[PDB]
Each structure stands twice: as C-alpha cells, then as structure tokens.
Amino acid sequence: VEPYPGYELRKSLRKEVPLPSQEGTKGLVQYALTTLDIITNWARQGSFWPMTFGLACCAVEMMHLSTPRYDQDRLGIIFRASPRQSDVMIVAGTLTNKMAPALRQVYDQMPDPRWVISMGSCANGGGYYHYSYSVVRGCDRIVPVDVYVPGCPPTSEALMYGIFQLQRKMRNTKITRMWYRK
Amino acid sequence: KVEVYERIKSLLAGFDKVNDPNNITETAHFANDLGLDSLDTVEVVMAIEEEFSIEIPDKDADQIHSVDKAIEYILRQPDA
Amino acid sequence: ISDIHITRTGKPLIRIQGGRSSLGEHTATVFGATGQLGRYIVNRLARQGCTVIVPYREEMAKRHLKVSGDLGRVIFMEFDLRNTQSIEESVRHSDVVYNLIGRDYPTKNFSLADVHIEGTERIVEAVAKYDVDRFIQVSTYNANPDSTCEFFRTKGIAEKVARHVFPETTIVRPAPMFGFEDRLLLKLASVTNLFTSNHMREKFWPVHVNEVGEALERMLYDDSTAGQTFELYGPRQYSMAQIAELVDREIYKKRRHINLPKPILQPLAELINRVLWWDTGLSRDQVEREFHDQVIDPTAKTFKDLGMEPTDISKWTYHYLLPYRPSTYYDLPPSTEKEMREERKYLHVLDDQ
Amino acid sequence: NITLILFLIGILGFVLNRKNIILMLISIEIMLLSITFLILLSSLNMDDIIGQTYAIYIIVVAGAESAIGLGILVAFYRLRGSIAIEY
Amino acid sequence: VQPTKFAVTVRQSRNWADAKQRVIAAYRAWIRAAPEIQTMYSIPFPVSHIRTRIRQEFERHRYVNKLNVVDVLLQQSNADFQETMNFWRQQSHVMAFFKEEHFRGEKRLPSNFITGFLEGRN
Amino acid sequence: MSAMSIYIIFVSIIAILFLAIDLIFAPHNPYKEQSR
Ligand SMILES: NC(=O)C1=CN([C@@H]2O[C@H](COP(=O)(O)OP(=O)(O)OC[C@H]3O[C@@H](n4cnc5c(N)ncnc54)[C@H](OP(=O)(O)O)[C@@H]3O)[C@@H](O)[C@H]2O)C=CC1
Numbered sequence: 001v002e003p004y005p006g007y008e009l010r011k012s013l014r015k016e017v018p019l020p021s022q023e024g025t026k027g028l029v030q031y032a033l034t035t036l037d038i039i040t041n042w043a044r045q046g047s048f049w050p051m052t053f054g055l056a057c058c059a060v061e062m063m064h065l066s067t068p069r070y071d072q073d074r075l076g077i078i079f080r081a082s083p084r085q086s087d088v089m090i091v092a093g094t095l096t097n098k099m100a101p102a103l104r105q106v107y108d109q110m111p112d113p114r115w116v117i118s119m120g121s122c123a124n125g126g127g128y129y130h131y132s133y134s135v136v137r138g139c140d141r142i143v144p145v146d147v148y149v150p151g152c153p154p155t156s157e158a159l160m161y162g163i164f165q166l167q168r169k170m171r172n173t174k175i176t177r178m179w180y181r182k
Numbered sequence: 183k184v185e186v187y188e189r190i191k192s193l194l195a196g197f198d199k200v201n202d203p204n205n206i207t208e209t210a211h212f213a214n215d216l217g218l219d220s221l222d223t224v225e226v227v228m229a230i231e232e233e234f235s236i237e238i239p240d241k242d243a244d245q246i247h248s249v250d251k252a253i254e255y256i257l258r259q260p261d262a
Numbered sequence: 263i264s265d266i267h268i269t270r271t272g273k274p275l276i277r278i279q280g281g282r283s284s285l286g287e288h289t290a291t292v293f294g295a296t297g298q299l300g301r302y303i304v305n306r307l308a309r310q311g312c313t314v315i316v317p318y319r320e321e322m323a324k325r326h327l328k329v330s331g332d333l334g335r336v337i338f339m340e341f342d343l344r345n346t347q348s349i350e351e352s353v354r355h356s357d358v359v360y361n362l363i364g365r366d367y368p369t370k371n372f373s374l375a376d377v378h379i380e381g382t383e384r385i386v387e388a389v390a391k392y393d394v395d396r397f398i399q400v401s402t403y404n405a406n407p408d409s410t411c412e413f414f415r416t417k418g419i420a421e422k423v424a425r426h427v428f429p430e431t432t433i434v435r436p437a438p439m440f441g442f443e444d445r446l447l448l449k450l451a452s453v454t455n456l457f458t459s460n461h462m463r464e465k466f467w468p469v470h471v472n473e474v475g476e477a478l479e480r481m482l483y484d485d486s487t488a489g490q491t492f493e494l495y496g497p498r499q500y501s502m503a504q505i506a507e508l509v510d511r512e513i514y515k516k517r518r519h520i521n522l523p524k525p526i527l528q529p530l531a532e533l534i535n536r537v538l539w540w541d542t543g544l545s546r547d548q549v550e551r552e553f554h555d556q557v558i559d560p561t562a563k564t565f566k567d568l569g570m571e572p573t574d575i576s577k578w579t580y581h582y583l584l585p586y587r588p589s590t591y592y593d594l595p596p597s598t599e600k601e602m603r604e605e606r607k608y609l610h611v612l613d614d615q
Numbered sequence: 616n617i618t619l620i621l622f623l624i625g626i627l628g629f630v631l632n633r634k635n636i637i638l639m640l641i642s643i644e645i646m647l648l649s650i651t652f653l654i655l656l657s658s659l660n661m662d663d664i665i666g667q668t669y670a671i672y673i674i675v676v677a678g679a680e681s682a683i684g685l686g687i688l689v690a691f692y693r694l695r696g697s698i699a700i701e702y
Numbered sequence: 703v704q705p706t707k708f709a710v711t712v713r714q715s716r717n718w719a720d721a722k723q724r725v726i727a728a729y730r731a732w733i734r735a736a737p738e739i740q741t742m743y744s745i746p747f748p749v750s751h752i753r754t755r756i757r758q759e760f761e762r763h764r765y766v767n768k769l770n771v772v773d774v775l776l777q778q779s780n781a782d783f784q785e786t787m788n789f790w791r792q793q794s795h796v797m798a799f800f801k802e803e804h805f806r807g808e809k810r811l812p813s814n815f816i817t818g819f820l821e822g823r824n
Numbered sequence: 825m826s827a828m829s830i831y832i833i834f835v836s837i838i839a840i841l842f843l844a845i846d847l848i849f850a851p852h853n854p855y856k857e858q859s860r
Pocket residue numbers: 182293294295296297298299300319320323342343362363364365366372377400401402403435436437438439440
C-alpha cells in the first residue's frame with residue numbers, strides 16, 4: 001500500500017531552511033527588503049510615543065522621565081493622550097477589577113503595531129496588593145505584555161532601560177523579511 | 183372597547199402562568215379566577231402595559247387586579 | 263470529565279479540574295495556532311490548566327495567545343514548516359498534537375501541495391518519531407484525494423499520509439467556519455467589490471468556529487475518538503446568497519457583485535494572487551472551490567457523537583455583525599405626533615448662553 | 616448660459632422641496648449667485664465698473680438676509696424643536 | 703433622585719403593607735427595564751430570559767418574614783437598579799449575573815452522588 | 825504654462841503621494857468597527 005506514488009523516495013531529499021533568527025541575508029531582493037525593515041524600524045524607534053495609564057505612584061516616576069535630568073524628548077519620546085496617536089501602552093500602577101475594563105478598552109483602541117510595557121511590581125504580578133479582593137494579579141491577565149520593568153517603584157533609569165529593551169525588540173523586528181520566507 | 187379586550191384576551195392566552203385558557207371573561211379576577219400570583223400580576227400588567235404602549239404608574243398598577251379594571255384604565259388613557 | 267486519564271501510551275495523568283491555576287496535566291502542541299481557529303483550541307486548553315506548545319512563524323502575531331494561560335502554560339516555539347528540528351522539538355513532550363496548518367491559496371514559497379502534504383508529512387513523521395498518544399489532523403470538508411480542487415485534493419491526500427504512518431489519527435473535516443474574525447461573515451460584511459463566477463450559488467452547512475473549538479477539546483477527552491473521522495457542520499443547508507442576505511438583513515450594506523464567467527475569471531485570478539502580497543480573497547484555486555457543493559460523508563462521525571449540538575448561523579448574525587452597524591441620530595425614523603407634542607415642553611435653544 | 620442654468624437650479628430647489636425649509640434657504644442664495652454672476656459677466660462685456668459695484672452690494676444684502684434668515688430660523692427652532700414640515 | 707438619576711433616600715419600611723408595596727414596585731421597575739438592559743448591555747438572551755431570571759432573584763427571598771431583613775434586601779435592589787440604569791456596570795458585570803456564561807456553564811455542582819464521585823467532587 | 829497652475833498641481837502631487845505611502849505601506853485591517 002502507498003499513500004501517493006511519489007512517497008518513500010521523495011522524503012529522501014528535502015530542503016532545510018534555517019529558522020529566522022539563524023537566517024542569513026544574501027541577494028539583491030533580500031538586501032532590499034532588509035533595508036525597508038531597517039528604515040521602518042528606525043522610525044518606530046526614533047519617534048516613540050507612549051499612551052499611559054498612570055494608575056498610581058509608578059506614574060510619578062514616569063513623570064520624572066520627562067523632567068530635565070532625564071528628558072524623553074532628547075530620545076524622541078512624547079507621551080500622547082489618545083490611544084490612536086500612540087505606539088506603546090505603559091501600564092504603570094496597581095490594576096484593580098474596576099479599572100480593568102477600561103484598560104482593555106484602551107488597548108483595544110491602539111492601532112497596530114502595538115507594544116505594552118508593564119511597569120512596577122503592582123502591574124507585573126499584583127505586588128503588595130496581590131492577596132486582595134480588588135486587585136488584578138498582573139496586567140497580563142488582561143492584555144499582552146512585551147517588557148516587564150521591576151521595582152516598587154523602578155527608578156527612572158530602570159524605566160528608561162525597559163524602553164531601550166523594547167526599542168531593541170523593534171530593531172530586531174523583521175517586517176518585510178518575514179513576509180518573504182512566508 | 184371591543185379591541186381593548188381582543189388584544190388583551192389573546193395576550194393572556196399565551197401567558198403560561200394562567201392556569202387554563204377559556205377562563206378569561208369580561209370580569210375575570212387575576213387571583214381568584216386565573217390563579218395568577220402576586221408577582222404574576224405584575225408580569226401580566228406589564229404585558230398589558232407594553233402591548234398598548236403606555237406606562238402604568240404604581241398608584242394605578244396596584245389597582246389592576248381584575249380584567250375589567252384593566253379595561254377601564256386603558257380607555258381613560260388618550261393614547262393607544 | 264474524569265480526574266484520571268491514562269494516555270494511549272499508558273502513562274496516567276491525575277488532573278485537578280479548575281481554572282487557570284489548576285492542573286489539566288495535558289501537554290499540547292498546536293500547529294497552526296495563530297489563525298482564526300487555533301485561538302479557540304489554545305484558549306480552551308490553557309484556561310483549564312494545560313501546557314500548550316504554540317509553534318509560531320511571526321513574533322507579533324502570536325502575542326494574543328499568551329493572555330489565556332498562567333505562567334509556564336503557553337510556551338512559544340519559533341518554527342518553520344521546512345525546518346524539521348523545530349517540528350521535532352515542538353512535539354517531544356506532547357501528549358496530543360494538533361495540526362491546524364493550512365492555506366487556501368498558493369504562495370511564492372508554498373503550493374497547496376507543499377503546505378498540506380509536505381508539512382503534514384514532516385509533522386506526522388515527528389508524531390510517529392516520539393510515540394505521541396493522540397494526533398488530531400484538521401482536514402477540510404469536501405476533502406477527497408481525487409478532486410479538481412487542489413485544496414480538496416491536497417488536503418484529501420494529507421488525510422492519507424496521516425494514517426499511513428499514524429493509523430490512530432483523528433481526522434476533523436469542518437464546514438466553512440463562521441463567527442468572530444472569520445473569512446465567511448466578515449467577508450460578506452467587509453468587502454465591497456466582490457468577484458465570483460458561480461452566482462454566489464455555493465451550498466454548504468456553516469458551522470460556528472466556537473463549537474469547532476469546543477469539539478476539538480472533546481476529541482482529546484474521549485479516547486474513543488482516536489482513529490476515526492469527524493464531519494463537523496451546522497444544522498441547516500445554506501447558500502452563499504442566502505448567507506449574504508442575512509448579512510444584508512442585519513447591517514444594510516450595498517456591495518458590488520461582478521460575477522465574471524469562469525473562463526475570463528480564473529486565468530485572471532492567478533495573476534492577482536501572483537502579484538499582490540496579501541490574501542486578496544480570490545485566487546485560481548479559490549474560484550474552483552466556488553463550483554463545488556459540500557457533500558457530507560455518511561460514514562463519518564458528527565457533533566452528536568461528541569455530545570454536542572451545532573448551532574445555525576442565523577441565530578448569531580446579529581451578534582457578530584452588531585459592531586458593523588452605522589446608526590447615528592440621522593438614520594432614525596420620522597417622528598410621531600405624540601412625541602412632536604413632547605418637544606413643546608422643552609426649550610431647544612439656550613438664549614442666555 | 617451658465618447663469619440661466621444656475622438660476623434654474625435655484626428654481627428647481629423650490630420645485631422639489633416639500634420638507635426642507637433649509638433647502639428653501641439654500642436655493643434663494645443659488646438664485647442670488649445667478650443674478651450677481653449674470654450682472655458681472657455683462658459688466659466685463661461693456662467695460663463698466665457699476666456692474667461690479669452692483670454685484671458687491673448684492674453680495675452684502677445676500678449675507679444680511681442669511682443673518683436675518685438663520686436668526687429667525689433659530690427663534691422658530693427654540694420653541695419648535697424641529698425644522699420639519701409635517702405632510 | 704436629587705444627587706443622581708435613580709437615587710432613592712434610604713427609608714425604613716413602616717409595616718408589611720408598606721414593605722410589600724415597595725417589593726412589588728421594585729419588581730415592576732426591573733421587569734419594565736429588561737428591554738432597556740438588553741440593548742445597552744447587548745445581552746445575547748431574549749428579554750424573556752432576562753425577565754424570568756429577574757424573577758428568580760426575587761423568588762429567592764419570597765419567604766423572608768422579617769421586616770428588618772426586607773429593607774436591606776430592598777436597598778440592595780435599588781442600588782443595583784441605579785448602577786444598571788446608569789451605564790455604570792460594565793457588560794462584564796451584567797452578563798456575569800447570568801450563571802451560564804461560565805466556561806463550565808450552569809452545570810457546576812455535581813448532579814448526584816455518583817457523577818460527582820467519578821469527577822472528584824465536580 | 826503659467827506659474828500659479830504648475831504650483832497647485834505640484835502641491836496636489838505631494839498631497840497625493842503622502843496618501844500613497846499610507847495606503848500602500850501602512851497596514852490595513854478590514855475591520856472598521858442619540859440625545860437632544
Ligand atoms: N475556516 C474555514 O472556513 C475552514 C478552514 N479549514 C481548515 O482549518 C484549518 C484552520 O482554519 P483557520 O484557522 O481558518 O486557518 P487560517 O488560515 O486562519 O490559519 C491557518 C494557520 O496555518 C498556518 N500556516 C499556513 N500556511 C503555513 C505554512 N506554509 N507554514 C506554516 N504555517 C502555516 C498559519 O500561520 P500564519 O498565520 O503564520 O500563516 C495559521 O496559523 C486550516 O487548515 C483551514 O484550511 C477547513 C475547512 C473550513
């Protein structure tokens with residue numbers, strides 16, 4: 001019995017494509033799509049506009065990222081009020097059950113591409129109020145998260161460090177080079 | 183007056199908590215005749231209320247215990 | 263439903279049946295999890311305490327799947343349908359492996375042959391390489407090894423190779439699925455310029471993705487579903503034109519139907535698919551799919567065998583089309599005399615502000 | 616010839632209107648734009664500046680009727696709550 | 703309703719004739735409101751299912767023979783009515799009152815002894 | 825031709841082009857989803 005005539009001989013020879021992380025780059029078409037990515041990633045990095053949910057104290061430390069000692073503007077960061085104008089959501093503060101429907105509504109309004117930063121112990125996993133009836137134990141029970149910044153509160157350098165991790169994640173985002181492999 | 187009975191009459195026909203159809207008369211009492219309960223009354227009058235597109239007040243709805251009383255309230259309301 | 267599961271290989275699982283923090287103790291690998299169906303099978307296992315291995319091609323796409331599970335439950339693996347090591351190491355720990363991978367069109371990197379055959383080959387060979395207990399292959403309705411449709415052909419041939427090497431394969435042949443984020447109702451909802459060549463006269467038995475997602479859970483939970491073929495479909499016969507008028511009856515949308523004959527449409531269909539980089543919804547093989555009608559396999563098990571009732575699509579159109587309902591104060595009906603009188607008890611202008 | 620056609624449009628706005636008291640406001644201004652436009656094109660033909668000036672004063676009276684017209688329509692709406700004509 | 707649209711000053715029932723009058727007026731308002739609750743909260747249920755389910759929540763306390771217990775049960779209703787008629791409750795709170803939109807469903811206790819034994823207490 | 829004409833057309837071309845980058849290159853999700 002045979003499933004289809006070509007089997008038992010076709011399986012002997014098959015090609016092995018390395019995974020995208022280990023993929024190289026070679027060819028005119030490949031370079032060209034790669035350039036399109038680097039430029040696109042350069043602008044997703046240079047203009048970094050965060051929508052923010054200052055729920056509690058970690059927002060104070062996010063305000064000290066806008067002050068003269070650490071200025072966000074010098075790196076291109078501009079906090080926008082609207083989700084439509086934004087790139088990344090920074091959940092900074094304790095998420096409560098009453099606040100969670102509005103977190104999901106605001107995230108649902110973010111045009112793609114979307115990134116979320118969870119800032120602080122309270123948003124990361126509940127923190128001091130983890131064993132409470134009113135607190136969501138982590139904002140990732142509500143939305144997807146891309147970077148977690150530790151601390152109660154993280155220092156302003158720490159939140160900057162988290163933005164650089166995210167900026168690096170975008171620099172490694174293949175947009176037109178993934179569409180090419182499939 | 184014939185219509186305000188006809189629309190009400192068919193309404194209680196589909197109402198399940200009515201013990202049995204054909205007990206509906208011009209003077210049928212919600213508790214004694216139809217065997218409808220205190221909270222089955224409100225449900226009925228609400229159907230009475232909505233079908234004729236009018237809002238029954240509490241001061242008046244507590245009075246709607248028999249079909250004839252329901253009729254005389256709907257006639258008094260100019261809109262229908 | 264039971265707290266003990268002896269897997270087909272023989273090891274016992276002692277599950278605690280609760281929610282996110284519970285112990286489902288099933289390890290799952292879902293191939294094809296980033297599409298529209300896979301998010302229902304993934305969420306159903308994860309939200310009851312099971313590990314789900316989710317192989318993915320794109321990083322961004324997979325992100326919505328992690329929310330459904332607690333820490334250590336949704337594991338993501340970077341995989342390629344032509345890298346066997348990625349497939350091998352995705353299924354070495356799995357109890358059940360699912361295969362939902364499938365396109366409706368050829369790409370510059372995959373012919374319906376490459377996807378449905380060379381991937382099912384490459385994947386089921388790994389299932390057989392590690393003695394995985396249950397392997398569930400989602401095929402298509404109208405799958406048939408000798409068909410003019412490459413979709414019905416190549417997906418029908420995969421069903422052959424699935425049991426040639428893994429005789430204990432569940433086959434699942436779902437009807438065109440519908441619901442949230444589908445290509446059935448959302449197509450009729452969203453597109454405006456629509457091309458066909460068979461007068462939208464396809465007849466089939468539309469089924470809700472949500473029962474399909476729930477059904478795939480129960481094939482894991484019943485050991486008796488192992489080794490037989492299922493035919494999941496809804497309760498009523500429908501035609502595309504009858505389906506569209508339901509979309510029409512809810513949303514009040516005007517769309518252009520072009521309905522160009524098959525000889526002048528199919529050769530053109532290949533061209534558009536060969537130069538446009540997105541799913542344009544019409545391609546050469548997709549147009550041929552228009553001429554067939556769904557034929558229900560009489561020897562295949564159905565929803566009832568899984569204790570389930572399908573629902574029709576008419577009971578759901580208002581739900582899944584309500585977001586697409588432009589209703590402002592303009593489109594409201596002309597007012598009645600009773601309410602026109604009510605307006606005379608208000609002042610409609612503020613003359614002191 | 617364009618001046619006469621655009622005059623018809625204003626007339627026909629009165630022919631097709633059973634409910635829009637706003638289109639009656641609009642078509643009066645389309646009719647004024649015809650007559651001003653005709654005066655202007657004949658002024659270019661005769662090398663006369665008085666036709667230009669007469670257009671200017673038509674434009675100024677036209678704006679003033681809009682103020683009086685929208686002002687009266689506001690006074691009506693405050694007590695009515697509707698610009699609609701029951702028919 | 704001075705501070706808010708559906709506010710009712712906290713009142714203490716004077717006697718059973720008064721207390722039953724208030725219960726019936728509470729039930730009347732709720733079942734009147736069911737069409738308005740079903741569009742705002744986009745409840746994928748018939749208005750009849752909503753009304754029959756509202757009835758169950760009054761049917762639970764039909765045998766209370768304490769007048770001090772009725773007033774707290776009436777105040778709870780009035781407050782629930784106010785937060786539902788003002789769009790303050792989220793669709794998630796409202797359609798979570800229906801105990802069949804659990805992924806385990808309405809059937810969440812074991813039916814009898816044996817079925818709960820084979821499933822480990824459900 | 826006159827200069828004022830070429831100037832409006834030029835601005836018109838630039839205004840169209842910024843549409844083209846948006847409509848060509850930006851992603852496009854099909855899903856686009858009463859008081860007095
Ligand atoms: N939905 C329907 O109406 C019906 C569908 N089916 C079949 O059911 C299955 C699931 O349905 P549905 O969720 O709608 O499918 P989708 O097209 O929405 O998703 C298919 C999945 O397969 C993956 N995939 C496709 N091609 C490849 C490839 N060459 N290599 C690797 N991964 C690939 C996709 O990943 P990626 O997004 O990265 O491409 C995606 O996760 C498919 O086989 C489908 O054909 C059967 C009958 C009807």
